[PDB]
Amino acid sequence: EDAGLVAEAEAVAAGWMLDFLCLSLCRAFRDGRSEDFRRTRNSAEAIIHGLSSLTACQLRTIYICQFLTRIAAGKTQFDERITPLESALMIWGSIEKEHDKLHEEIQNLIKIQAIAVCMENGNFKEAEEVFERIFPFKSKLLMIISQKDTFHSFFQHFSYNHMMEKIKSYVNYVLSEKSSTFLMKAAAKVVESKR
């Protein structure tokens, strides 16, 4: 038995498990299956520790998982001194991906929702701190926060539901790109055989 070839087979299998768990995390996010998302996220986190070197595609995969993790924790010790949605904005702006119309829409929706979720939770001091970290339009947005005007028409256009719908659209592309991964494809074949 060669220790080096065994380690290589374990690295190949870790790569396969990573893709499968990203696919599962995406479907759970899309479906709103919170507990399933939590478990899959925990598994992806554990599996990602088994890898010490990542390819360009594997880095894209783990960063999509981290982005979705922060988006799901948006309204929830987290060392970072910023909110989950601000942390999602940093991951989003650094992922190796096209900066198309959809990228800017999600970016601006997360920017507004990082402030709005603090107002929804009644923490208006925090909402101002988030605004200062991210940002004529600024003066109007600052006036809104100051007057606890949570349901202003601006917030109804840049809503939480709109942020989630735009991100779910991106998830569907990722779900389609990885729908052909080895582990999921093999498992599906076994299920159809039964059946």
Ligand X SMILES: C[C@H](CS(N)(=O)=O)c1ccccc1
The residues that touch a copy of itself, with contacts defined as CB under 8 A, are 3, 5-6, 8-10, 12-13, 16-17, 20, 24, 27, 31, 39-40, 42-43, 45-47, 49-50, 182-184, 186-188, 190-191
Residues of this chain that interact with ligand X (CB under 6 A) are: 44-45, 48, 62, 65-66, 69-70
73 touches, from a copy of itself, ligand X, none (C-beta below 5 to 8 Å by class): none
Please choose, from the candidates 10, 23, 1, 8, the residue with its C-alpha nearest in 3D space to the C-alpha of residue 184. Answer: 23
Class of residue 159 by CB neighbours under 10 A (exposed 0-12, middle 13-18, buried 19+): middle
Residue nearest to ligand X (CB): 45
Q: Which is nearer to ligand X, 56 or 190 (CB)?
A: 56
Phi-psi region of 120 (alpha: psi -120 to 50; beta: other; left: phi over 0): alpha
Question: For residues 16 and 50, is the Cβ–Cβ distance under 8 A?
Answer: no
Residue 117's CB is within 10 A of a number of other CB atoms, namely 21
56 touches, from ligand X, a copy of itself, none (C-beta below 5 to 8 Å by class): none
Q: Which is nearer to ligand X, 30 or 70 (CB)?
A: 70
Q: Which is nearer to ligand X, 94 or 146 (CB)?
A: 94
Helix, strand counts (H, E) of the chain: 10, 0
Nearest distance from residue 174's CB to a copy of itself, in Å? 15
